[PDB]
Structure formats: C-alpha cells, structure tokens
Amino acid sequence: WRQNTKSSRIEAIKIQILSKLRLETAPNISKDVIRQLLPKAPPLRELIDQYDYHATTETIITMPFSSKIQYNKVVKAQLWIYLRPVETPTTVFVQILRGIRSLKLDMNPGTGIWQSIDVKTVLQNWLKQPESNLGIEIKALDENGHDLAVTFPGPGEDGLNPFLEVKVTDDCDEHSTESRCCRYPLTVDFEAFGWDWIIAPKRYKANYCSGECECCTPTKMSPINMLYFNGKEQIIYGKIPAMVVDRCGCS
Amino acid sequence: STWRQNTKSSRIEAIKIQILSKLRLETAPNISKDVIRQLLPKAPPLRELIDQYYHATTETIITMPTESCCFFKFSSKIQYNKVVKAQLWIYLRPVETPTTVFVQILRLIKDGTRYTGIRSLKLDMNPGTGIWQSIDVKTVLQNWLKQPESNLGIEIKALDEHDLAVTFPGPGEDGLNPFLEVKVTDTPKRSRRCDEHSTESRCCRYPLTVDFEAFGWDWIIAPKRYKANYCSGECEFVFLQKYPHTHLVHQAPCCTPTKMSPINMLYFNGKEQIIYGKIPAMVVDRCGCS
C-alpha cells in the first residue's frame, strides 16, 4: 500500500510548504534564469554550504548532588536552615560549614527563624572539579550553648529538614516490516519535481507514521531551515516549523 | 453508557506513560502519604512554588535591483525596528595592472543635486582575481522603511587610475549582480484562535480531568488535579491545493489535537530529590482532522 500512498504523501507536504511560506503559487523561473539571478558571493555560500523539547528543569531542591549538572548552568543557589523556637530571648551564632559561612542574630521567644545562606560559589566549585564534597555541617549555638539548628530531623519535626535549592537554566519500519505503528522513512527531492528554485535544501528526509495503534499521528516534529526565491526577485532565507517527523504516537 | 465509558480508563493510561517518558523516568516513584509528610519540607521557598496557581519564520532577506541603475525596492511588510544588520554588496572586476580603487556609494535625493553620500571607500587591488566589498546600509535602510516616498535608488562607482563596479550585469557575469543582504527578526504575530455531554457527532473536545491523588500518584504535590480533555470522532481531509481544483484525502484521515498547552508540575526524583518543571503539550485545546 506504501507504493501508491507515497505519491500522495509528498503532495500533502508540497501544499503544506506553499501555505506555511505564505505563497499563493510557486515562482516560475528557469535553471538558466536562476544561474544569473543567484549571486555567487561569500555571504550566500556560507549559508549554502552550512549542510554539506520534551522536558524542562527549572529549580532543583536537594535533600541531605545529581550526576547531570554543569558549573556554568546554575543561576542561584541557597542552603536553608530552620532554627527551633526558643523559650528565653537569646542570641544565636549560626555557622554553615562543609571555608564556611558565619552569621550572628538575636532571637525572640516563639519564633521559628528559617534563615538561608548563599552557596552559589561552593555548589559551582564542587561540580567544576572535586565532585566529592557533599558534607552536611551547620551550627546555631544559643546563649547557654544549645544548638537550635535542625541538623538531624527530630520526632516532632514534620517538614523542617535543611535543603539546598538551586535555580538552573535547561524511523523503525524501513519499508520492510509489520508492527503497531512505525515511522516509515520518506525523503523529499524538490529538484526531482517541477521547480528548481529551492536553493537549499534540494533533498531532505521527512518520514511519516503508518499503523493501526491500540489513531497514529507524529509526536516529535523538528523544523528545517530553507533558502528560496520570491516575487520581484527576493532570495529569502527562513526556517519552516514542523517538517521532519522524529517520533510516532497513538492519539 | 457509550464508547466514552470504556475509553476513559484507557485514555488516562495513555498520559500516565507519556508523563513518565517526558520526565525521563524509568518507573514512577513509590512514596506513601506518611513518607511524603516527612520528606516534603514546610518552608517559605516551597509554599511559594506550591501556591503558584506557527508560520514559516523569515531570517535573512536578499533583495535584487530593478528599474523605475541599481534601484532597490524593499517590502512594506518589514518594519524599521525589525531589522538587525543590513549590508549592500558590490563585486569589482579583476584588474590587469595593480591599481587602487575609489569606490563611492550615494543615495539620490531631490542647490538641488541628485546625490547624497552613503559610504566612500579607498582600497588597493592586486591583478589576481575579482573581489567583493560589503558596505553597511543599516541606518539608510531604516530611514527608507520609515519614509518610503524618499526611498529613491542608489549609484555605485569604482574608478581605478575605468569603473570596475558591476552596475549593469555583463554577459559573462553569471552571479555577480549587486544585492542587499538584510538580517531581520521575525515577530511571532499569533492571531486570535465544543461538545459538553451528549450528541458526540463528528469530533469535538470531550472534557477529561486527571486526578493523581485518586489513581495512587500521591508522590506529586502540584497539581493534584488537572484538566486535559481529548478528541473523539471521525472525518475526511480536504487540502485546497491550487484552488478552485481542491484535493481530498480518504483512508481505505483521523481526529488528533491541534493546539496543545503545557503545564507546570512539582514532583519527586528517584534520588529522593524534589524537582520543579514544566511538562510540554499536556492540555488539549483544539481538535483537528489529520
């Protein structure tokens, strides 16, 4: 069935291309006309010889590091500490150690301070070289000497364990098989049919879904860059979205 | 009582695996309500995240000369602020003797002289081969799109000790005519763009919600319940290629979603970690025939 529906599949993209390109009709210009119209210049040859999105991670909160993290990919990192409510007004001397951080602050009775500390430079230093420095150490001495820091989560803690939040930036058919639905390979050769104004790419692989499922339609679609002619002679370069089929799914 | 009752249990299973595959997870994490009560930390930075509830793009345009020498006609569609970098190009013919060239570019504006200096340049030339020369016109092109009544043509000169500039393309030129290479940023320009209970008819977005807390997915804290409707029906495709001669497809064409909006999700990693992200294409807005 693929032999007859191959001539119909290439016609489906042929119009999809002309519609996406905001063109009413394809321009009529001969191979001898384009040979003089297309200028052989360095800025054009640089773009011509240039051939020869399912998940996003924003903020990652760690518990008392991941194997996939770059030292320059990080945006902002800060280690959070919960201090237990005091009964008597006493000053605390918090110190986050793993070189360390140090802060001194007063504390009134009945307050649950959640003071946090910037670790951005330390979290980047770990990933850049040692990769072996994951050490939990935090102190918060009261005026008497009792540590108010939640080093080891207590029985009546219920969501008070310290954490480090870090904001971070970012074919199978082969024309000879039978299964539920597979991406059967399919190429598009513009130079082989009618026009020759498609400067680049003259031949591009698109592929298509074919099966019964449990209908079958593409899931992942990647765009392709293209240089083409226009009215009043305007050699335009652009990027046509969703033209190549990568994955097939059931929907 | 209809097809929707049986397909409802299968539709939620289709997203269940889709969510995991997108999340790059091999299996869904097994966490009890008592486990998450101690794992999820009650802190201000956490409660902040929890209470947090398509044409062909154009990049570079190269214009060609016309008559009304070397008069260029830009499109009225492109804006003066949309331009990035504009450069006029000139090809100089190969010389026989080493001689310096005084290239001069001028825009015609109506003492009423028909000339205004764009960029005058002087450069030496060896008798080897022919070379190009780029000239920035960005400031002139922007003033051209701003007032197209004064968008008159330009004149190119290249005197040597005879004009070596390719004003009028020769017989043995073959790709050497002057052009205007312009880089532009294409604005998205998104224009403005069903069944409730019974009478299914021919495909309409039938409402469908997903409750993770109901199906044993208590390991995710937000969003516990989210609407993600689905398409249901049948049709025949009709592509209007070369109107009035409209083409038509008939399988011996099905209903699938067209517009899909993503959703932000707060979940738990297999390393006991807690990650926040945005899963793409999870909510179905429009249904189409493809």
A112, A82 Cβ separation under 8 angstroms: yes
- Is A209 within 8 Å of B253 (Cβ atoms)? no
Q: Do B55 and A251 touch (CB under 8 A)?
A: no
Closest B-chain CA to A23: B56
Count Cα neighbours of B24 within 13 Å in the Cβ-side half-sphere: 10
Question: Are A57 and A69 contacting, i.e. CB atoms less than 8 angstroms apart?
Answer: no
Q: Which two tokens stand for residue B287?
A: 């249904």
With contacts defined as CB-CB under 8 Å, which chain A residues touch B240? 15
φ, ψ (nearest 5 deg) of residue A108:
-90, 160
Q: What is the DSSP letter of B285?
A: E
The answer to whether B140 and B152 are in contact (CB under 8 A) is no
- Name, in order, each residue with C-beta under 8 angstroms of B178's C-beta and a sequence gap of 6 or more: B65, B70, B88, B89, B90, B91, B156, B165, B166, B167
- Residue A237's DSSP bridge partners are A227, B60
Elucidation method:
X-ray
Give the tokens for residue B49. 């995240």
User: How many residues belong to chain A?
Assistant: 251
Which long-range CB contacts under 8 A does A124-133 form with residues at least 24 apart? A124/A71, A124/A72, A124/A74, A124/A77, A125/A71, A126/A65, A127/A65, A127/A69, A127/A70, A127/A71, A127/A74, A128/A71, A133/A98
With contact defined as beta carbons under 8 Å apart, do B152 and B71 qualify? Answer: yes
- Report how far residue B89's alpha carbon sits from residue B176's, in angstroms, rounded to the nearest whole number: 10
| The two structure tokens encoding residue A88 | 């008597």
Is omega for the bond preceding A185 within 30 degrees of 0, making it cis?
Answer: no
The whole-angstrom distance between residue A120's C-alpha and the CA centroid of its chain comes to 22
Q: Which residues of chain B does A157 touch, with a Cβ-Cβ cutoff of 8 Å?
A: 38
Backbone angles phi, psi at A111, to 5 degrees: -115, 140
> Which tokens in the block code for residue B285?
């807005």
| All structural domains of chain B | 3-53+197-289 (2.10.90.10), 60-184 (2.60.40)
Q: Nearest-CA residue of chain A relative to B277?
A: A57
The tokens describing A190, both together, are: 């513009």
- Contacts of residue A42 in chain B, CB cutoff 8 Å? 132
Instruction: Identify the closest residue of chain B to A232 by CA–CA distance.
Output: B64
Query: Taking CB atoms and an 8 Å cutoff, what residues of chain B touch A54?
Result: 21-22, 280
- Any idea which residue has 């321009």 for tokens? A27
Q: How many CA atoms lie within 13 A of B289 on its CB side?
A: 14
> Peptide bond before A43: cis, by omega within 30 degrees of 0?
no
Q: Are B184 and B87 in contact (CB under 8 A)?
A: no
H/E segment holding residue B5: helix B3-22
> How far apart are the C-alpha atoms of A220 and A244, rounded to whole Å?
9
Q: Which two tokens stand for residue B241?
A: 């290629």
Calpha distance B187→B82 (Å, rounded): 8
| Coil vs helix vs strand at B155 | strand
| Cβ–Cβ below 8 Å for B241 and A66 | no
In eight-state DSSP terms, residue A37 is H
Work out the minimum CA distance from A44 to partner chain B, whole angstroms. 9
Indicate yes or no: CB of B175 within 8 angstroms of CB of A57. Answer: no
- By the 8 A CB rule, do B14 and A251 touch? yes
- Contact assessment for residue B52 and residue B264, using Cβ atoms and an 8 Å cutoff: yes
